[PDB]
Design an enzyme around this catalytic site. Structure first.
Site, PDB file in Angstrom:
ATOM      1  N   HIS A   1       0.905  -1.157   0.000  1.00 40.90           N
ATOM      2  CA  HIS A   1       0.000   0.000   0.000  1.00 40.90           C
ATOM      3  C   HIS A   1       0.945   1.208   0.000  1.00 40.90           C
ATOM      4  O   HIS A   1       1.607   1.501   0.998  1.00 40.90           O
ATOM      5  CB  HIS A   1      -0.899  -0.005   1.240  1.00 40.90           C
ATOM      6  CG  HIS A   1      -1.994  -1.028   1.181  1.00 40.90           C
ATOM      7  ND1 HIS A   1      -2.437  -1.713   2.290  1.00 40.90           N
ATOM      8  CD2 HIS A   1      -2.739  -1.476   0.143  1.00 40.90           C
ATOM      9  CE1 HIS A   1      -3.406  -2.540   1.941  1.00 40.90           C
ATOM     10  NE2 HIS A   1      -3.610  -2.414   0.642  1.00 40.90           N
TER      11      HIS A   1
ATOM     12  N   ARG B   1      -3.393   4.606  -2.138  1.00 39.00           N
ATOM     13  CA  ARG B   1      -3.205   3.296  -1.517  1.00 39.00           C
ATOM     14  C   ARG B   1      -3.121   2.114  -2.486  1.00 39.00           C
ATOM     15  O   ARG B   1      -2.422   1.132  -2.222  1.00 39.00           O
ATOM     16  CB  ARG B   1      -4.363   3.056  -0.532  1.00 39.00           C
ATOM     17  CG  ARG B   1      -4.583   1.613  -0.070  1.00 39.00           C
ATOM     18  CD  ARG B   1      -5.945   1.514   0.631  1.00 39.00           C
ATOM     19  NE  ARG B   1      -6.353   0.150   0.966  1.00 39.00           N
ATOM     20  CZ  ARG B   1      -6.041  -0.486   2.093  1.00 39.00           C
ATOM     21  NH1 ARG B   1      -5.310   0.115   3.021  1.00 39.00           N
ATOM     22  NH2 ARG B   1      -6.471  -1.728   2.295  1.00 39.00           N
TER      23      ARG B   1
ATOM     24  N   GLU C   1       1.519  -4.208  11.543  1.00 42.51           N
ATOM     25  CA  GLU C   1       0.921  -2.893  11.313  1.00 42.51           C
ATOM     26  C   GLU C   1       1.754  -1.992  12.223  1.00 42.51           C
ATOM     27  O   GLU C   1       1.621  -2.033  13.450  1.00 42.51           O
ATOM     28  CB  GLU C   1      -0.548  -2.859  11.739  1.00 42.51           C
ATOM     29  CG  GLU C   1      -1.477  -3.629  10.820  1.00 42.51           C
ATOM     30  CD  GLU C   1      -2.276  -2.721   9.908  1.00 42.51           C
ATOM     31  OE1 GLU C   1      -1.682  -1.837   9.251  1.00 42.51           O
ATOM     32  OE2 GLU C   1      -3.511  -2.895   9.847  1.00 42.51           O
TER      33      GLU C   1
ATOM     34  N   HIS D   1       2.711  -3.388   6.972  1.00 47.87           N
ATOM     35  CA  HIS D   1       1.815  -2.266   6.696  1.00 47.87           C
ATOM     36  C   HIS D   1       1.883  -1.268   7.861  1.00 47.87           C
ATOM     37  O   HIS D   1       2.657  -1.437   8.806  1.00 47.87           O
ATOM     38  CB  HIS D   1       0.362  -2.762   6.621  1.00 47.87           C
ATOM     39  CG  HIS D   1       0.086  -3.739   5.520  1.00 47.87           C
ATOM     40  ND1 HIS D   1      -0.650  -3.410   4.404  1.00 47.87           N
ATOM     41  CD2 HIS D   1       0.405  -5.049   5.383  1.00 47.87           C
ATOM     42  CE1 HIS D   1      -0.776  -4.470   3.626  1.00 47.87           C
ATOM     43  NE2 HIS D   1      -0.144  -5.479   4.197  1.00 47.87           N
ATOM     44  N   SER D   2       1.048  -0.238   7.774  1.00 50.18           N
ATOM     45  CA  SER D   2       0.885   0.768   8.822  1.00 50.18           C
ATOM     46  C   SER D   2      -0.523   1.312   8.560  1.00 50.18           C
ATOM     47  O   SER D   2      -0.993   1.258   7.419  1.00 50.18           O
ATOM     48  CB  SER D   2       1.936   1.885   8.717  1.00 50.18           C
ATOM     49  OG  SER D   2       1.613   2.853   7.736  1.00 50.18           O
TER      50      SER D   2
ATOM     51  N   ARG E   1       0.877   4.561   0.277  1.00 42.03           N
ATOM     52  CA  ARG E   1       0.873   5.647   1.260  1.00 42.03           C
ATOM     53  C   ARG E   1       1.467   5.335   2.637  1.00 42.03           C
ATOM     54  O   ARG E   1       1.688   6.239   3.450  1.00 42.03           O
ATOM     55  CB  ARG E   1      -0.554   6.155   1.448  1.00 42.03           C
ATOM     56  CG  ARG E   1      -1.494   5.161   2.107  1.00 42.03           C
ATOM     57  CD  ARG E   1      -2.892   5.746   2.141  1.00 42.03           C
ATOM     58  NE  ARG E   1      -3.881   4.867   2.752  1.00 42.03           N
ATOM     59  CZ  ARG E   1      -5.193   5.059   2.648  1.00 42.03           C
ATOM     60  NH1 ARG E   1      -5.656   6.081   1.937  1.00 42.03           N
ATOM     61  NH2 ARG E   1      -6.042   4.227   3.237  1.00 42.03           N
ATOM     62  N   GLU E   2       1.725   4.065   2.908  1.00 37.21           N
ATOM     63  CA  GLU E   2       2.279   3.671   4.201  1.00 37.21           C
ATOM     64  C   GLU E   2       3.801   3.774   4.144  1.00 37.21           C
ATOM     65  O   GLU E   2       4.514   2.779   4.264  1.00 37.21           O
ATOM     66  CB  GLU E   2       1.813   2.249   4.515  1.00 37.21           C
ATOM     67  CG  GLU E   2       0.294   2.176   4.567  1.00 37.21           C
ATOM     68  CD  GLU E   2      -0.258   0.761   4.585  1.00 37.21           C
ATOM     69  OE1 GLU E   2       0.532  -0.205   4.647  1.00 37.21           O
ATOM     70  OE2 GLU E   2      -1.499   0.629   4.541  1.00 37.21           O
TER      71      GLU E   2
HETATM   72  N1  LIG Z   1      -3.553  -0.459   7.274  1.00 40.48           N
HETATM   73  C1  LIG Z   1      -3.704  -1.575   6.528  1.00 40.48           C
HETATM   74  O1  LIG Z   1      -3.324  -1.584   5.380  1.00 40.48           O
HETATM   75  N2  LIG Z   1      -4.281  -2.658   7.110  1.00 40.48           N
HETATM   76  C2  LIG Z   1      -4.489  -3.955   6.406  1.00 40.48           C
HETATM   77  C3  LIG Z   1      -5.259  -4.976   7.280  1.00 40.48           C
HETATM   78  C4  LIG Z   1      -5.088  -6.393   6.781  1.00 40.48           C
HETATM   79  C5  LIG Z   1      -3.914  -7.132   7.097  1.00 40.48           C
HETATM   80  C6  LIG Z   1      -3.750  -8.456   6.622  1.00 40.48           C
HETATM   81  C7  LIG Z   1      -4.757  -9.053   5.826  1.00 40.48           C
HETATM   82  C8  LIG Z   1      -5.926  -8.332   5.507  1.00 40.48           C
HETATM   83  C9  LIG Z   1      -6.093  -7.007   5.982  1.00 40.48           C
HETATM   84  C10 LIG Z   1      -5.288  -3.704   5.111  1.00 40.48           C
HETATM   85  O2  LIG Z   1      -4.859  -4.475   4.099  1.00 40.48           O
HETATM   86  O3  LIG Z   1      -6.184  -2.923   5.032  1.00 40.48           O
HETATM   87 ZN   LIG Z   2      -1.646  -1.466   4.253  1.00 33.40          ZN
END
Ligand SMILES: NC(=O)N[C@@H](Cc1ccccc1)C(=O)O
Ligand SMILES: [Zn+2]
Length: 307
Positions: A69, A127, A270, A196-197, A71-72
């Site tokens: 993603h 994103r 995260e 991620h974040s 933006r993270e």
């Molecule tokens: N902030 C962020 O991106 N959080 C993740 C949450 C996630 C993690 C693992 C599997 C599915 C979903 C996202 O993809 O939205």
């Molecule tokens: Zn993410």
């Protein structure tokens, strides 16, 4: 600039700077790291993975991706620090040295290069990927809703303009398929970590179903240990548990796919923070975030080697 020892790790970089960094690292440590191009993005940019290996044929491996993603930003910044740390600790840190002497580590710092470039030139909060599709003026797919694990089910959006759009079908995004093909061909990955974040959470499968994984007891304890290790540095508090029980139902996530492929140690991190800054985390927190995250990651790796 012209030496990873002079590179500024306490600031955010552009795509070109990160790619240049990779070449410098490889040039400085030819016997330990090599750069592999596993595919090309929708807009044609090369997709690179850094392979840290000490030798062997197809040694069991650890997969780590960041920036799926765009933006993270804290994720790609942490990936750059990780890459440098690997070269600094091998031969110096007893635990890490033991890990690299028996396993390979694959690090993908910029998993979504098109989106990353876009965050620097037009939309800092982008994103998704950058693919376009006839039946819509909206662009991109949420790469972490595009994997073949409960694809299209609750936890992803079906509208192309949505930030959580899953795409036309599983693995439609070349950025996702590039990883799937490489992991499948390799066939010997033992751990799969996606970073991620933000939220400060350590998650394990599943997100698409309420069904408990067969290895719930072991993974929960590994996560418990990793979280304690991470917290020991600056006191940063993390929560842990399955995706669906910790955040919400989410389908088509990478970790669910990898676990279903038989890769037992599948976790998503995260990073900081819990919302004060969100995606716009200050550069002054890059090093501290990277330092503590490494402790949590090392913990998981150690478990993988002895299991
Ligand atoms: N902030 C962020 O991106 N959080 C993740 C949450 C996630 C993690 C693992 C599997 C599915 C979903 C996202 O993809 O939205
Ligand atoms: Zn993410």
């Amino acid at each position: 600039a012209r030496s990873t020892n002079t590179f500024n790790y306490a600031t955010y970089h552009t795509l070109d700077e990160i790619y240049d960094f990779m070449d410098l690292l490889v040039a400085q440590h030819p016997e330990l790291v090599s750069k592999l191009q596993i595919g090309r993005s929708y807009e044609g940019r090369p997709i690179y993975v850094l392979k840290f290996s000490t030798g062997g044929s197809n040694r069991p491996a650890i997969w780590i991706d960041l920036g799926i993603h765009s933006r993270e930003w804290i994720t790609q910044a942490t990936g750059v620090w990780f890459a440098k740390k690997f070269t600094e600790n091998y031969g110096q840190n007893p635990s890490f040295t033991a890990i690299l002497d028996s396993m390979d580590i694959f690090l993908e710092i910029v998993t979504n290069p098109n989106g990353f470039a876009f965050t620097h030139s037009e939309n800092r909060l982008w994103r998704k990927t950058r693919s376009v599709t006839s039946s819509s003026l909206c662009v991109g797919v949420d790469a972490n809703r595009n994997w073949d694990a409960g694809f299209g089910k609750a936890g992803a959006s079906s509208s192309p303009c949505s930030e959580t759009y899953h795409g036309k079908y599983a693995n439609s995004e070349v950025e996702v398929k590039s990883i799937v093909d490489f992991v499948k061909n390799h066939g010997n990955f033992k751990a799969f970590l996606s970073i991620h974040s933000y939220s400060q959470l350590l998650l394990y499968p599943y997100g698409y179903t309420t069904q408990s994984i067969p290895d719930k007891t072991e993974l929960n304890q590994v996560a418990k240990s990793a979280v304690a290790a991470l917290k020991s540095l600056y006191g940063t508090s993390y929560k842990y548990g399955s995706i669906i029980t910790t955040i919400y139902q989410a389908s088509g996530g990478s970790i669910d796919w990898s676990y279903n492929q038989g890769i037992k140690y599948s976790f998503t991190f995260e990073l900081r923070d819990t919302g004060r800054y969100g995606f716009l985390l200050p550069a002054s927190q890059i090093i501290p975030t990277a330092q503590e995250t490494w402790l949590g990651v090392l913990t998981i790796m150690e478990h993988t080697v002895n299991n």
